[PDB]
Amino acid sequence: SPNYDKWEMERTDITMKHKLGGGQYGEVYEGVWKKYSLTVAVKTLKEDTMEVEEFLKEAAVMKEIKHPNLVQLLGVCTREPPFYIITEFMTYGNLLDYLRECNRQEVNAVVLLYMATQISSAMEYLEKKNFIHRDLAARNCLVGENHLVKVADFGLSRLMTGDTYTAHAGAKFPIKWTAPESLAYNKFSIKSDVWAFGVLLWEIATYGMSPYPGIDLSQVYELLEKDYRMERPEGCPEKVYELMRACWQWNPSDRPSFAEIHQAFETMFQESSISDEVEKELGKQGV
Numbered sequence: 441s442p443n444y445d446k447w448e449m450e451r452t453d454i455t456m457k458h459k460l461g462g463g464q465y466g467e468v469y470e471g472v473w474k475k476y477s478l479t480v481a482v483k484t485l486k487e488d489t490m491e492v493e494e495f496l497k498e499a500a501v502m503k504e505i506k507h508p509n510l511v512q513l514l515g516v517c518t519r520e521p522p523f524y525i526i527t528e529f530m531t532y533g534n535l536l537d538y539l540r541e542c543n544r545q546e547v548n549a550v551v552l553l554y555m556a557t558q559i560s561s562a563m564e565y566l567e568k569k570n571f572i573h574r575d576l577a578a579r580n581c582l583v584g585e586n587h588l589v590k591v592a593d594f595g596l597s598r599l600m601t602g603d604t605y606t607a608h609a610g611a612k613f614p615i616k617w618t619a620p621e622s623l624a625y626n627k628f629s630i631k632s633d634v635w636a637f638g639v640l641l642w643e644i645a646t647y648g649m650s651p652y653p654g655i656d657l658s659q660v661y662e663l664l665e666k667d668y669r670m671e672r673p674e675g676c677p678e679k680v681y682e683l684m685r686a687c688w689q690w691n692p693s694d695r696p697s698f699a700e701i702h703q704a705f706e707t708m709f710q711e712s713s714i715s716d717e718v719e720k721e722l723g724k725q726g727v
Contacts, residue, residue: 638687
């Protein structure tokens with residue numbers, strides 16, 4: 441069948457349990473995949489959407505993407521009206537909820553930066569895959585053991601090979617994570633997620649505080665248009681704010697790639713570590 445998906449398995453084959461909810465995330469449930477007896481997480485659509493195409497679209501994406509910093513698909517059920525999307529069970533839950541419920545004495549500045557590096561590792565892969573997310577945020581990220589974070593909830597992640605207009609009439613995009621061009625012209629690029637990533641970086645560094653806090657929504661576009669961007673969080677290193685300023689660049693052509701951002705974090709990590717701010721192979725032909 442052209443409708444084939446290798447992750448398609450029987451609903452009976454998994455034993456669902458109690459919901460984890462997710463607050464603003466969606467209908468997430470606990471399950472156990474019988475033949476391995478391992479607890480798993482199952483996200484289904486909330487009825488009132490009735491937009492099967494955008495939620496079910498993630499099922500195809502997670503089969504066609506793989507990275508240690510991306511939510512791995514464990515199964516799906518699109519052969520049956522009770523549509524389910526089944527993945528691994530995330531120990532520390534959603535990242536926004538985790539930072540709200542974290543041990544702040546354990547979760548210091550450098551781990552917040554490292555967890556942003558985990559996300560950058562996921563998003564640079566999406567860049568390689570020419571995939572775009574358009575909903576990149578702590579609420580849409582997951583955390584498990586050893587502060588491992590992975591990008592999740594691939595509902596707004598539409599597959600294009602090089603299309604600028606990834607919207608569809610109703611612009612369902614989080615404004616403070618949406619790029620200047622994406623607000624003004626309603627035109628999107630790989631750089632539109634680079635804005636979302638920088639806003640997420642700030643959100644992590646503030647222990648899950650809300651980005652652009654205390655400003656009216658009615659003022660948000662105005663100030664963003666005036667080149668305004670959030671300043672460095674208390675405890676967030678100088679180097680990280682420079683990285684943020686690049687991610688919050690007005691011009692997408694002057695705004696950096698996720699490859700460049702992935703470089704920027706490992707470049708920063710120089711605590712008893714080799715200063716990897718070097719170029720392509722220091723020898724002779726370093727063009």
